[PDB]
Structures are given as C-alpha cells and as structure tokens.
C-alpha cells in the first residue's frame, strides 16, 4: 500500500535540491505515516546536503516536520489517525540513556538520525524510477509531503495549535529552549547570555525569560538580530564587533554571568564566552564546529571561579512532554517563536536555503504540497 | 596578654624555614586562640615560601592545623576552651557565596587566606625582636605552637578522635573527598577516575569508595602510589607511562568514566582526562597549574558526549559539617587517611618539605613543641 | 547615644496597639540602626499581640520593615549609612543550618525572632518612663520609627526602588515566592495550585508565573481574591465553596497538580489539597494551624502517586540574594505585589489590623512618622 | 511452538498453591521466553493469592524471577538466547513517566502488573486441560519453569553472577535499596533509619551503608532481625517494644534522623517515624497498608522542621542500570543480600509461604524444576 509523495531530493554534494515525485511505503511496526503540512529548514540540512556529514545520497532530508497522522503501524499504542504531531529526532528507547530519560544521548543516535536507511539498510522511499532514496533522516525525512516516523519521535500536540508553525519545535527551538530550561536549569533571578542570536539563540533568550532570568544578554554581530532579541525578551544586546564582550558582560552582571549558551559553533566565541562566566557560572555548548576543532580554557580561571562547561545535545529534553509545554507557552503569548519564521512553498526550498545561509531568515518553514 | 610561641618562619624566597621564638596576641572579636598540636605540610606552603604566590615575607605559613582551644574572643558563640578543633580555610561569612553555603567561593577568599595580615594590615604575630610576622595564612598560620583562627574556620571535632592526625582534614583531604562527595556528587554504582594519586587524589579514591562507586581508577606514574591506591579502595590502577590512559579507562568502563578528578595540575593530563569521560561524564578540576596556563578540549567530543568540566575549590563543602563526617568515617574504619601520613617534629620541617617535594611522603604532619 | 522613636506597643493580650514615645539605644557589634520608613502588618503580629505565641509584653512587634541605615555598629562590614534595607527574619549565621544556606531552619530561630530580648535578656527599647520594652521581634521590632537589626537580616536593596513598598519582602512575600521558587522548585511547564489567596498565596501565584508554570490555580472562598488572582497571573480560579476542589483540580490538570502550596493553615484544606496532587506531585506547607493540630493523608494514595508533602519555613531562601531578585522582578513589571498593598499611617495601626483580620486588605503597610 | 512447564497455580482465595503441569506459548513481538532458574516469594504474592488484590484466578503468580533467555520475539533488540536475566516489574515504556526515566510510575502500571492477561485479555499460559491461566503477573508470572517477559523488564546481568540468587533484585531488594539510593538520595555522612527489618528494610540498611551513611538505625520487634541488621551494616538496632523509638532515634542522632524508610505498612509506625525526623529530614514510604488507610502528621512539626514525607514505588529506579549495579556490589562483597535468603524447591512453595508469613525466612527463593 505505497503512496505518492512530492519530495525535495539532495542528489549531489553542494547541489541545489530537486523537487521530485516519489513513493513511500505503508507504516510497519510502531511507525506512523504522517501527512506533512510544513517543515523547518536548518543549516544542518544544508551541511548534510554539502556532505560535510556524508549521509549517503540521493537523500531526502528535513528534520523539523509537523503534520497529521494518516496511518499507524500495528504496534502503535498512543497515536491515531487525525492526531497532530511534531516530528523530533530518533532514539532507540531501550538503551541506558533512553531509559534514564536522556534520549538525546541515545547509544544509537547517529544510526537512527544520520544512517540514511533503517537498521536493515532498507529505505522507505523510492524515487520516480523506483530506485531507493536514502531516508530515515532524523527518523523522519520530512522534506516530503508524507513521512514515516516512529511513535516515539512523533509528538502529539493540541489540534488547536497552528500546526504549520510547529515543526521547528522538533529540533532547533527545542535545542535552544531545552538547553536553557533543562541542561542549564536557568531559574528565577539569574543572569543568562546567549552567544549567537540565530534561531537556537533566540529560542534560548525566550526560554530564559520564561524561566525567570532577570538579566538576559544576546550577543551577535547582526544589528537586526540584536534589535529582535530585545523585542523577544532580552534585557541587553551586545554587538561583539563593537565592544569587548567579556568586559561588557562583566559590567552588566557585576562580574560575570550565571549561565551562558554557545550556539555559533565558533571556537573563539566559545573560549571567550567561558571567560565571561561569573562565580559558579555555567557555559552550555550547543553549536558544533568542524570535527577535530579544539577550544581552550584558562585552567585557573575555571578552577578559582568554580566554572562549569557542559556539552548539550538537542536540548537534553523529554520531547513528548517538553514540546507540548512549548506549544502551550506559545498559545499563552509567552513564547513568540513565530517571530523567527518565514514561510516558503516547498518549490522554493533553494531560496529558503539561501535565506538561511545569508541569515536573512532565522527559521524558514517549507509548506508541503498535496 | 600576649604569649610565647615557637614558629617556622619563611624569611626569603625559596629558602629553608627557620625555627624561631615568636609572640602571639590574645584573641579579639570572634577569634579563638588554639594550642596547636600538629599541622599538615602542603606543596601549597612551599609554593608560597618560594613566592610563586607572593604572600609578603617574613611569614608564618601552615594551613592544616589541629589543636585545642585555649582562649576565646568575646564574640565567640560556639567554641569553648578545651574544644578540639581542625583549622580550615578562611571565609567572610557574609557575602552571597558564603550565605549560600559555598564559602569556598567567598568574595574575600584571597584576602582572608593569602593577605599576610588582617583587613587593617595588622599581624597577630611578632618575632623575637618585636617585628611583625606576616600571618593570617589561610586564617590560621598554623606552623606555630599557637594560632589564631576565627570561629567560623575553627571546626570542632570529637575529643575521642586522635587529634594530631586531623589537621589535613582542614585542606587537602577535604579538597579531595569533598570534590568527590559534594562537587561531583559521585554516588552508588558509578565509575570514578582520579588523575593523580597524591594526598588529594588518594582522598578522592577513598571518598569514592565511601560514596558507593563500583569502579574506582587511580592514575599516576609512581608504582608505590598505585599499589597504595589499590589498598585504599581503588578497583584499578593505571600507570600512565605504560598504557594510553584514555584507551585504558575506556576499556575498564565500557566507553569512559562517569566522574573524574584532575589533581596533578598538569594541563596535558587534564586535557587527556577530559577525553576519558563517558556519556554525560564530568571532569572536576582541583589541581592548579601556573597562572595563565590553558588547557584545550575537543568541542565535538564534549558536545556529543554531554561532557561536563567543572572547577572545584577546597572541595566546595560546608566544613563545619563535612570535617566531622570525615572524622566519624575514619573512626568507623571507613576512611584510612592515616595511611597518607608521616609525622615529623616541627624542627624537621625542612626534611618534611623535602619529602613532600620528592613524593616520599604523601602528607607530612608536623608535631608542635610546647 | 540613645534616640527618640514613636512605636506601636502591645501592652495587653488581645488589646489594641498604643502609639507611644520610646527610646532606642545606639547600635553595637554588627547591628545597624535603621530609620524605618514603612512596615508591613501581618496576622502573625496579631497572633503575638493576642499571646497565642506569648512573646513577653509590653512588646514592640513588626517584622516587615523597610528603611534607611542611619548608623552602624563597629563590626558591620557591608552596610553603610544611607543604604536602603529590607529587614527580614533573624538567624544566627553560625549553626549547621545557617552554614548550609538554610537560615530559615536556624537552630536559634525562635530565640532570635520570638525571644523578646537579646541573648542576655536585655532590650534595646525603653518606654517613655524608662521601663524595658520587649523587642528583637524577628530581630527588628519594626513597628517603630527606628529599629535595630543585625547586618545579616538587614538586606540592602537598590536605592531607586520605592522603599516604602518593600518591607513585606522581608517575610510574607518572600515566604510565598520562595516556597514556589526555592522549596518546591516550580519550573517551566509545570502546574501549580495555591490553597489560599492571601498575601502569601498571591505571592506564590505571581512567583509561579515568573518561574514558568503553565497552569496556575488559585483556590479560595472570597470572589474578589479569586478575581485578583487571575489578574496577577493565575490561569484558573476555584471557589472551594462552589465545586469539589480536588475533582476540579484533577479536571484542569488531567489528573492532579505537579506542585501545591497550602497557606490557609486549615488542616482540612491541607488534607484535601494533598489528594489533588498528580503523579510525583509535591504539596508544600507554609500555613500554620494551632500547635498540636494534626492532618491526615491516605497512605496508598501518597505511595502509589509518588506524592511528596514538605514543610516550608519563610520560603527557605537566602534573603540577601532573593529579596533583591524580587525587587528587580518588581521593577521590571514582572512581580506586581503592590496590588496586595494598602498604606496606612502608623497612627491607624488598629484599623490596619482590623482590615487584615477582616480580609479587606491583603497586606497593610504602615508609614512611620519622624 | 508451545512448550511444557511446571507451575505453581493459585486456584482459590487463601488456598495453598498447587503444583501443576502447564503450557506456555512462544514469544511474540518484543517478548523473551525465559528458562526460569529460581524465583523469590513475596508477601505480595500471598496477598494476591488471598485476593486482597483480586487478580483473576486461577493464576500463576511470582514476580522475582531469574533465568536464562531461551527464545526471543522478532522485535527483541538487545537480548539473545543464553543471556542471564532478572525479571522486574512491567512498564509500558512510552508514557510520560516512562519517558522521563520513572517507569515505577508508569500510567499502565496496574494493567501491566496486576491485569492477569495481556491488553487483549489473552493469557500466554494454559493449564493441563487447556484452560487459560491468568498470568502476566508483574509482566512475568515467574512461579513456573518458563516465563514470558517483555524485553524492557528482562534485565541482563553478568553470567558470572550466581543467577539463582538474583531474582529478588527484580522487586523487594530493588525497592529497599532504590528507595535509599534514588528516592531519598541518602549520601555520605547522613543518618538513616529503617522502620521494618524485613527483606525490604534490610536491603535499605545495606544500601545506606553502601551510600555512605554514618548512622544506620534498624527498627523492628524481632531480636534476631535486629541482630542480623547489625551484621549487615546497621550502626544501631532499636526494639520498638522496649524503648520509645522516637526518643531513642532523637538521642542517637542528636535531634532526629536525616532520612527514614517506612516498610512495615503499619500506619502507627509511619506516623511515629515521621516524628523522628530531624531538621530537613525526609521519610520515604514503601510499605502499603490496606486501601483506605490514613496516617496523620503534626502540621507544625512538619512545617517548623522542614520535614518531607515521600511515597516511593519499587525504589523509583531505572532497573536496567540499577539491577546490574546491585549485582556488581554483591560480587564485590559490599551487598550481602544472600544473608536474607533461604532456598526451597518449587514443590515446597507452601512451606516457603508459611516461613515468609511467620517471618522465619526473610526472602524465600524457589528453585524451579526442568
Ligand atoms: Zn537509545
Ligand atoms: Zn564570604
Ligand atoms: Zn543559625
Ligand atoms: Zn509507561
């Protein structure tokens, strides 16, 4: 019982996406088949398209999907046709990390999210000529009008929420907001600095406001992002080309910030931000540089300051509870991540990729045809 | 009401200590005057003697004192003459860090512990000719037969404990044991690696056994320290000159250790030990290199592993509760830190310094004359 | 160097306060002398006036003072004349609980706050005829135009804050807000119910909104308090005379609330509220019934639900950091506790007491003459 | 592909078990078929046999199984034939509680553990005449020579461990040890009291010793259990018929215990034990009285003491990590729970039930025939 889809396909390293007819098989096991309404586009999709992470091509990418369950496998227990879902990253659900509530550190994370196929090497998508299309990208491959996900990464959300907006809660927004709320455990009355005011950093700024922080510092080089950060809840905005960011943060906070989040991936920014921590302060790291990149820290500064540096994957959340919390906060007017979004038709995916790379659009969302 | 003391005096950078008569004034305010029974000697005393940290000379050092309260200032509330006390580091007791239970990060730490005088620039000790001797070293200057401490760093311990053994609980042993129990929060069933098997590292090994760790790895280059570590509770001992320590720890733990403590101060050891962390593992840092020393970490390894690096001062404990817990564990036969100790008369301080520097003695304790 | 004050004096059990001239001595030790601008009035003052807690009479009560430091004792380290301070409860600062950052559980709490005199049995206030007036009430006795406090319960606040509003941050508002932020650790996306919408409960409602709770339920019997609670950040208001509160909370939250705070002191309300907890939910208890009062719980409900019941004193905060956080949140427009307040001249203290007892005024603040 | 088993069957309320031939079907889905070596017997089995919890009869009970995987369903990912497993309680693995690492509070706990059948109402066991035998008891029904369990409650353990001893780690021993290590988070230097010295209480005593507690108090009425508790790591033993337990604990601990665990299920013991808590102390509750049973607490004592009361199910652990930690501690000589055990052949199940009820045997283990 296969069915026709329209998909954006990456066929060559660094080449534009092609919009193509394809076919997807029926769900098996505890998979759900999702009619995809809209999917966020991320720099991470483009990094895979460029083969810096060489997921085998031709491939259907996309890892910020939102849609409606159309069919369920025989093992699905908790989703039903008609449910609205946000598609998040894959996890195995049975390893020690998954079992402890930390699926972000699943032993099988890279196989399930970057493998290009299921554990048997099979794909669920075929192209117009019947050839396999590498898929299972973040256990969803949601750059297509239909997607398969496992029940545990298809997150039910209230039907009254505006579904086409919600796909980026499956990755980038959960990463920034979860880094603040869960990993760093930012709380009432603390100071927080976001190094980077892209979609992840803005999500962190907004999350720190929700969590009760009284000083919320956005650091970037783009004046319009700094202006937007102030509108989204930051108390201070620092242009790092114009001041010494370490000295500036020390002035604002009286000696250094309680919590910081590095989302640029630039090791010089990371090394500098660690110096901006205050007594017992904690830097969380979510931006990834090229493999092999090192950062340095001053040992005595870390020691005498009681400083912490912590790596964070995907916001280290429990998505099935955390994504609906973010939806509710948004519905309450407390989490305006719609301000990060521009919508595009799937057909315009290459323009959205360009706008993502140029920074003109913090979070493109592609609307799928049906 | 001044009184005569015998003191070890550092008069010149890098020069041997001289044993000299001196005089100490009566306690004021909330000071207690302590008849010092025995004091640990630390590399940190020798680093100050060598003026790498230039506490003004001539100075009376010593920061691991144990003794009997002989007199109290008029503001002392909770100590009385005859009480047995361990002398720990100074803290102001009124800053935000002190008020939160984290005196190790007191805003006034360096003034109170390394200033060489009280806040008015006055010393409580004078030499035989009546000249000031810089003092207040770790709020005690316990290389002398009598010492002044404030009530909040004179820690009451049970009179049935063997008092002459207990002074090192005021610094090095509390640092290693507190790093494990408090900062890292090592708990039942976890894996722990000590990088360094000096007095601090051995204390950490013993503390990890108390706290319930099931894999306890001692890393050093001295075979006799590794042999001793196995006797004191380590499950594994690694000679880092003989194996790749990162690979060896990964083998023992199935991928990396939950908790690690760096006490050598060697930045290459620190950078290497951070690589040995397992998923969501935490490296604690207590060994201090020369100021300005940097260490590096692989950003993606820290990020993808959810690794934490944390600086730790003095074991980040509450000494008035933690030191008596360590005494009780010792009395119960569960904390054999006596195995680190060799006793020397104060007159032999320079031989104890030599044995500390050569590594022949993990923890010299100097017995004071009276 | 004594000085004249105007004080409200409780001379007889249950009798109206009398406004009287008095004299206060100069500060000693680490006391500060505060020119009191305005002081909150609490039911707790009236309970002592009524001698249910028999603080010896004649007595000057008041434990929510705000004012300006006028003089300091010779041991004061961190306050200076001209500083704006909120006066909170007394703690000894040297016991194990104080040393761990939990002065709310100070071993000397009742002596320091309810003793009626200092530890030597001496009062700092004398009446017009020169007789002692029992004082040191919550280490302040701030129903007077001047008050003595110790440095550790005189909390510096920014001079730009409206000082006359801030005294209730020293007790009732810190109790409600700290119970939520610190003891219960309410966090983003959780559900919270306040049993009681007096000043403490309203503070808890406002604090839960600051901390990120997405369901915030106010429970009371007074329609105007429920209406006000919705304006101050509650998502739901329940009149417990009109619905079954347990069933109603279960409906709103899908099975029970994550966090609850009991501030009425009514044991039937407490026992009922514990039933309203959801899976792994926690009830915090701040309202005190008469001594000897018991509450009951269903053992299997607590066991099978993983429920927690926790007693909370004074919001279990670190006041010197927490009170300035609440001031900053108020200045940012995020903590509108001014909506609880009505101002009265000290001369009208008995009318404010009446309005407190009748519930007409949630938090009277008395303005002091000078 | 069904296969023959020998099973202990409960056919009538309160009646002796009957040993009977039966047949079990092949595993499906993510089930594993286990050749059961030995199974603990619990009062909880007898409570179901007596129909106080009316699991439908005829039924095969047993919920402390240990055995060897003989066959796997097609969805099993992480177990293979030949693996040694301890069988613990069932959880769904996909609800919010499971997803957060708290399967003890699974939304489906009672269906999965007390339903008497799978979710379709089907049993996997049939008796000699072919009639259904109610099963799936704690997702195992391990009073039989073969058992079906789901992969997520079949916990792999090292093959070198003595397998026949390990079944009680699947319930009673994990409950006592996990209550101490996980729920209460007993840590180095704390005081702990076990109310009850049955198998659960003894496990808690042993776990508190592992976790570093320096005062470990066993409370019971049976002198031989108190004597055994001292041998297994308790520092103090209290016969509650001979002293006032509250006063005695207050004397031993200097005012009350940091942590307590109630395992008798007697509400008078619970209410009394809550009074024995010290400042900021926590009582954990694992013993279950009859449904509808209430306990009381003094509100002011709980409030002024900052006391906590917490319900605990199954030790609130992650069994796949916690059970192997307990096995390792046992192999290291640090967890001597073999001292609780007496072995019996399955044929003697009714004598083991009698010895359990009389208290003569703390933890019977039944050896299965094959
Ligand atoms: Zn996994
Ligand atoms: Zn301080
Ligand atoms: Zn105190
Ligand atoms: Zn579940």
Coordinates of C-alpha atoms in Angstrom, one line a residue, chain B residues 30 75 77 92-94 150-151, chain C residues 24-25 27-34 69 71-73 75-79 85-95 98 103 106 108-109 111-113 117-119 124 136-141 147-156 319-320:
Chain B
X30 CA 35.2 36.1 67.4
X75 CA 32.2 37.3 70.3
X77 CA 29.5 31.8 70.5
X92 CA 34.0 36.1 55.4
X93 CA 30.6 34.5 56.3
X94 CA 28.5 37.4 55.0
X150 CA 38.1 32.8 63.5
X151 CA 35.3 30.8 65.0
Chain C
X24 CA 16.3 53.1 71.3
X25 CA 20.0 52.7 72.1
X27 CA 23.9 50.0 67.6
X28 CA 26.5 47.7 69.0
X29 CA 28.6 44.9 67.4
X30 CA 27.3 44.1 63.9
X31 CA 23.9 45.8 64.4
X32 CA 22.6 48.6 62.1
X33 CA 20.3 51.3 63.3
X34 CA 17.5 51.8 60.7
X69 CA 20.6 52.7 57.6
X71 CA 24.2 54.2 62.0
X72 CA 26.3 51.1 62.1
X73 CA 28.0 49.1 64.9
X75 CA 31.6 45.2 63.4
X76 CA 29.3 46.0 60.4
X77 CA 31.2 45.1 57.3
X78 CA 28.8 45.5 54.3
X79 CA 26.3 48.2 55.1
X85 CA 17.4 47.9 53.5
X86 CA 14.5 45.5 53.9
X87 CA 14.5 43.8 57.3
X88 CA 13.9 40.1 57.3
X89 CA 14.0 37.4 60.0
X90 CA 16.8 36.7 62.4
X91 CA 19.3 33.8 62.1
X92 CA 22.5 33.1 64.0
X93 CA 24.7 32.7 61.0
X94 CA 27.0 30.1 62.6
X95 CA 24.9 26.9 63.1
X98 CA 22.8 28.6 58.6
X103 CA 18.9 30.2 57.8
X106 CA 18.5 28.1 62.1
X108 CA 18.3 29.6 67.2
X109 CA 15.3 30.7 65.1
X111 CA 15.2 32.8 70.4
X112 CA 16.2 35.3 67.7
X113 CA 12.7 36.0 66.4
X117 CA 15.1 40.5 74.2
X118 CA 18.7 39.7 73.2
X119 CA 20.6 36.6 74.4
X124 CA 17.3 47.9 73.1
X136 CA 14.1 42.0 69.0
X137 CA 10.9 40.7 67.4
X138 CA 12.0 38.9 64.2
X139 CA 15.3 40.7 65.0
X140 CA 13.9 44.0 64.2
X141 CA 10.7 45.2 66.0
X147 CA 14.8 49.8 64.6
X148 CA 17.9 47.8 65.3
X149 CA 18.7 44.8 63.1
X150 CA 21.8 42.7 62.7
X151 CA 23.7 43.1 59.5
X152 CA 22.7 39.6 58.4
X153 CA 18.9 40.4 58.4
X154 CA 19.2 43.9 57.1
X155 CA 19.1 43.3 53.3
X156 CA 20.4 46.0 51.0
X319 CA 17.4 36.6 51.7
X320 CA 20.4 38.7 50.8

